[PDB]
DNA sequence: CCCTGGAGAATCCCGGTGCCGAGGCCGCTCAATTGGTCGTAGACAGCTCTAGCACCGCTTAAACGCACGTACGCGC
C-alpha cells in the first residue's frame, strides 16, 4: 500500500484522530461514526488542552515555576471565566481554591 | 471500629474553613461539619460499594470512587 | 515585659492566606482512613480500600467541604456576620439541594 | 505489560507547541488525562444524544459542532468551532 | 367610618396560600412569548416558536423562579429579615453555582 | 422587538414570590429578577436554538426545549 | 408457531417487557442485552409507577378529587422524601410547590 | 405514523392499585415523561456500568446496580426485590 | 482620643545539597494506517397540509400610579 501517514498530520493536529475514532466506535454511542467527527473531536480537545496549558504556564510564571504542578492547573481553570463555567461541577485534586479574601474580612 | 467520626479533629475542621476563607468558626460548627461529612461519605462510599459489588471485587478501587463522584455532578480529576 | 497578644482575626486571616496558596492535605491520612472503613463496614463487611482509593476520597471530601465552607462564609457576610453558624451550613445545603 | 490507553504524551506535545520552556508533573499529567477523557465522554455522549433525537444512526462533524456549542459557553465555543471547522477543511483537502 | 385596612402581610399570606395550591400560570402568555422572540432574535433572525414550545419555556422559567424565590426567602430569615433583597438572590445563584 | 424585558410585570414577579412563600417583596427585586430570568432564558433558548439548527428545522419545538433543559439538569415533565 | 404469550404476563407485570427490550437494543446502550434486564427494568418501572399513582390517589382523595391531575402528581412526588430526592432536579409543569409557610411568617 | 407511548400500561397499573380514580391526558404526559426519563437514566447508567468493566452485555445485575445507584434509601431495595421477584417468576 | 516611631515575629528573597521524579532513548508490537466492497443511512427533489404568524373586535381582568401609615431594614 501507500505510506501510513497519520490522520493527525493530515488534519494539522496533534491529538490522535484514530484513537478518538476507535474510542467513539467502542464507546457505545452510535451505530456509525462519521469521517469528520474524530477530526472535529481532536481539534476541540487540543484547543481546550492548549488553552488551559497556556494559562497554566502563565500561572506557573506568576509563582516562578518551570514545571506544571496541579495548583497551576486549578489556578488556570478557576481564573478563566469560561473554564470556570465549563468546569463548575469539577473537583481538581491537589489544587485548592483561589486565594481571595472578602472585602469586609480585612482589618 | 467505633467513635471514628471524631477522627476529623476540630483544628482539621478549622483548617478546612481557613482554606475556604472563613473568618471565625463557632464551636457548634465542628459537630455539624462532621455530620455533613458523614452524610456525604455515606453516599459516595455506598455508591462505590455498589460499583465494587458489580465488578465481583472485594476491594474498592480509585476508579470506582471517581465514577461514584461523577454520577452526582462532582467529578474528580487526577485518579 | 509584655506578651505579643495577637488580637483574634489577624492570625486567622494569616492562616487563610497560608492555606489558600498551599496544596497540602489538611485532614490527616489515617483518621480519614479509619472513618471510611467504619462507614463502609455498615454497608458491607470485610471490605478493603486501596491507598489511592482513599486518596481520591480525601481530596474530594475536602474540596466539597471547602466549597461548602465558602458558601457558609458567604452566608455570614450576607447575614451581617463574620462568624459561621451551624444554621449557616443548613441553609447552604438546602439551597444546593443536598 | 498491558498497554493502557492514555493521553500522556499527546498533552506533552501540545504543551511544547505553545510553551516550549516549561514542563509538567505526572500528577498534573493525570489531571489532564482525566480532563480530556471527561470532555470526551461529555461531547460523545451529547453527540450520541443528538443523533438519537433526529433518528440518525451516524455521528458527523455537525454532531460534534452542536455538542461543543451546547457544552462550551460563549467565546470558548466559537474558537473551538473555528478550530474544528479548520481541522475538517484541512482533513478533507 | 373606615375600611377593613388589612395589616401589611395579611393579604400576602392569603396570596401565598392561594398560589401554592393553584397551578395557574402567574406570568401572562403574550408578554413572556415576545420575550422569547427578542432573545432568540440575537441567535437567529428567521426563527419560529410553537405554542407548546413557548408553553414549555414558561413553566420551566416559572418553576426556576419559584425555586429561586424559595432560596431567596430562606436567606432572609437566615439574615434576620422578612423582605427579600437583591443580594439574597446573588447569594442564592452563587451557592447554587449559577453566578 | 425592544423593551420586552418589561413584559414581566411587577404583579407577575410578585405572584412568583408569593408562590415561593415570600412575605415581603422589595422594590429593587424586580430588576434583579428580570436580569436572572433574562440570563436563564439566554441559556435555555440558545441551547434550543442549537438543537433546532442541528435538526434541520427553522421552528423551535417544545421537544428541543425539553433536551435543552435536561442537559443542564432541569428536566421538564409534561413537555 | 405456538401460542403468543407476552413476557409481561409470564413475569407477572403489566409494563411491556418487549418494548423495554426493543428500546434498549436501538438505544445504543450495549452490544448485547440480557433476558432479565428488560424484566428487571419493567419491574422497577412498574413499582415506581405504582408508588407514585398510589400517593397521587391518596393525594387526590385529600382534595376530594377522583381524577389524577398534575397538581396531585407534584404533591405525591414532593411529599415522599425518596421521590423528592430522586426527582430533585426535575421540573413538573402545572404542579406548583408544597403549600408550606415558614414559621416566622405566620402572625 | 405510530408514536410510542406508555399511557395504556400505566392505566392498568393505576386500576390495579387504585381502581376508583382515573387520570387526565395532561397528567398522562407527565407520567409518560417520568417513565421515559427514568428509562434513559437507568439504561445510561447500565451502559456506563458495562463500559467500566469492559462488559459487552447488560444483564439483570446491570439494571439492579443502576437502581441502587440512582434510587436512594428504602426505595431502592423495594425495586431490587420487585425486580428479583419478576426475574424468578420469568424463569 | 488619634498620629507616628521602634521593635517582635511570621513571612519573603536567596545560597548550597541532591534526589527522586521528570525528561530523553530503545524496541517493538499492537493498535493506527491503506485499499477494496458493498448494504445502507443520508442528501436531494416534489406534495402537501396542518399548525404558526399577522391583523382585527372587544371586554375585562391584569397592571401603572398615587395617598397613607405601620411592620420592618437599618443605624447605634
Swiss-Prot record, chains B, F:
Modification type N6-succinyllysine: residues: 10, 56, 70
MF terms (GO), sorted A to Z: DNA binding; protein heterodimerization activity; structural constituent of chromatin
GO cellular component: nucleosome; nucleus
Location of cross-link Glycyl lysine isopeptide (Lys-Gly) (interchain with G-Cter in ubiquitin): 70
Modification comment: Demethylation is performed by JMJD6. Monomethylation is performed by KMT5A/SET8. Trimethylation is performed by KMT5B and KMT5C and induces gene silencing.
Keyword Magnesium: no
N6-acetyllysine: modified positions: 10, 38, 58, 70
Residue positions, PTM N6-glutaryllysine: 10, 38, 56, 58, 70
Main location: nucleus
GO BP of this protein: nucleosome assembly
Residue numbers of N6-propionyllysine PTMs: 10, 23, 56, 58, 70
Residues bearing the modification N6-(2-hydroxyisobutyryl)lysine: 10, 23, 38, 56, 58, 70
Residues carrying Phosphoserine: 26
Source species, domain of life: Eukaryota
The entry's keywords: Acetylation, Chromosome, Citrullination, DNA-binding, Hydroxylation, Isopeptide bond, Methylation, Nucleosome core, Nucleus, Phosphoprotein, Ubl conjugation
Residues carrying N6-butyryllysine: 10, 23, 56, 58, 70
Residues annotated with Phosphotyrosine modification: 30, 67
General function of this protein: Core component of nucleosome. Nucleosomes wrap and compact DNA into chromatin, limiting DNA accessibility to the cellular machineries which require DNA as a template. Histones thereby play a central role in transcription regulation, DNA repair, DNA replication and chromosomal stability. DNA accessibility is regulated via a complex set of post-translational modifications of histones, also called histone code, and nucleosome remodeling.
Complexes and interactors: The nucleosome is a histone octamer containing two molecules each of H2A, H2B, H3 and H4 assembled in one H3-H4 heterotetramer and two H2A-H2B heterodimers. The octamer wraps approximately 147 bp of DNA.
Family: Belongs to the histone H4 family.
Protein name per UniProt: Histone H4
Full protein: residues contained: 23 to 101 of 103
UniProtKB/Swiss-Prot annotation, chain D:
A Gene Ontology cellular-component term: nucleosome
Glycosylation sites: 82
PTM characteristics: Monoubiquitination of Lys-90 by BRE1 gives a specific tag for epigenetic transcriptional activation and is also prerequisite for histone H3 'Lys-4' and 'Lys-79' methylation.
Subcellular location: Nucleus; Chromosome
Keywords: Acetylation, Chromosome, DNA-binding, Glycoprotein, Isopeptide bond, Nucleosome core, Nucleus, Phosphoprotein, Ubl conjugation
Cross-link Glycyl lysine isopeptide (Lys-Gly) (interchain with G-Cter in ubiquitin) per UniProt, renumbered positions: 90
UniProt GO molecular function: DNA binding; protein heterodimerization activity; structural constituent of chromatin
Subunit description: The nucleosome is a histone octamer containing two molecules each of H2A, H2B, H3 and H4 assembled in one H3-H4 heterotetramer and two H2A-H2B heterodimers. The octamer wraps approximately 147 bp of DNA.
Known role: Core component of nucleosome. Nucleosomes wrap and compact DNA into chromatin, limiting DNA accessibility to the cellular machineries which require DNA as a template. Histones thereby play a central role in transcription regulation, DNA repair, DNA replication and chromosomal stability. DNA accessibility is regulated via a complex set of post-translational modifications of histones, also called histone code, and nucleosome remodeling.
UniProt family annotation: Belongs to the histone H2B family.
The protein's name: Histone H2B 1.1
Native source organism of the sequence: Xenopus laevis
Full-sequence portion shown in this chain: 32 to 124 of 126
Amino acid at each position: 500500500r501507500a505510506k501510513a501517514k497519520t490522520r493527525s498530520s493530515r488534519a494539522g493536529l496533534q491529538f490522535p484522530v484514530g484513537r478518538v475514532h476507535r474510542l467513539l466506535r467502542k464507546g457505545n454511542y452510535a451505530e456509525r461514526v462519521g469521517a469528520g467527527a474524530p477530526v472535529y473531536l481532536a481539534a476541540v480537545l487540543e484547543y481546550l488542552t492548549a488553552e488551559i496549558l497556556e494559562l497554566a504556564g502563565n500561572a506557573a510564571r506568576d509563582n516562578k515555576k518551570t514545571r506544571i504542578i496541579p495548583r497551576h492547573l486549578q489556578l488556570a481553570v478557576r481564573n478563566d471565566e469560561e473554564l470556570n463555567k465549563l468546569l463548575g461541577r469539577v473537583t481538581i485534586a491537589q489544587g485548592g481554591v483561589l486565594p481571595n479574601i472578602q472585602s469586609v474580612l480585612l482589618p | 471500629l467505633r467513635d471514628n467520626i471524631q477522627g476529623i479533629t476540630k483544628p482539621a475542621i478549622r483548617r478546612l474553613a481557613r482554606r475556604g476563607g472563613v473568618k471565625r468558626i463557632s464551636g457548634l460548627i465542628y459537630e455539624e461539619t462532621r455530620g455533613v461529612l458523614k452524610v456525604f461519605l455515606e453516599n459516595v462510599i455506598r455508591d462505590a460499594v455498589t460499583y465494587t459489588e458489580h465488578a465481583k471485587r472485594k476491594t474498592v478501587t480509585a476508579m470506582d470512587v471517581v465514577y461514584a463522584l461523577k454520577r452526582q455532578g462532582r467529578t474528580l480529576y487526577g485518579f | 515585659k509584655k506578651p505579643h497578644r495577637y488580637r483574634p482575626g489577624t492570625v486567622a486571616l494569616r492562616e487563610i492566606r497560608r492555606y489558600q496558596k498551599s496544596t497540602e492535605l489538611l485532614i490527616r491520612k489515617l483518621p480519614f482512613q479509619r472513618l471510611v472503613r467504619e462507614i463502609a463496614q455498615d454497608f458491607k463487611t470485610d471490605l478493603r480500600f486501596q491507598s489511592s482509593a482513599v486518596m481520591a476520597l480525601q481530596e474530594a471530601s475536602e474540596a466539597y467541604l471547602v466549597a461548602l465552607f465558602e458558601d457558609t462564609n458567604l452566608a455570614a457576610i450576607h447575614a451581617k456576620r463574620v462568624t459561621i453558624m451551624p444554621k449557616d451550613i443548613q441553609l447552604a445545603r438546602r439551597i444546593r439541594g443536598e | 505489560k498491558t498497554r493502557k490507553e492514555s493521553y500522556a504524551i499527546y498533552v506533552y506535545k501540545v504543551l511544547k507547541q505553545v510553551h516550549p520552556d516549561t514542563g509538567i508533573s505526572s500528577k498534573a499529567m493525570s489531571i489532564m488525562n482525566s480532563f480530556v477523557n471527561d470532555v470526551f465522554e461529555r461531547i460523545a455522549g451529547e453527540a450520541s444524544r443528538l443523533a438519537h433525537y433526529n433518528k440518525r444512526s451516524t455521528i458527523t462533524s455537525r454532531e460534534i459542532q452542536t455538542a461543543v456549542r451546547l457544552l462550551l459557553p460563549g467565546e470558548l465555543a466559537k474558537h473551538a468551532v473555528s478550530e474544528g471547522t479548520k481541522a475538517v477543511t484541512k482533513y478533507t483537502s
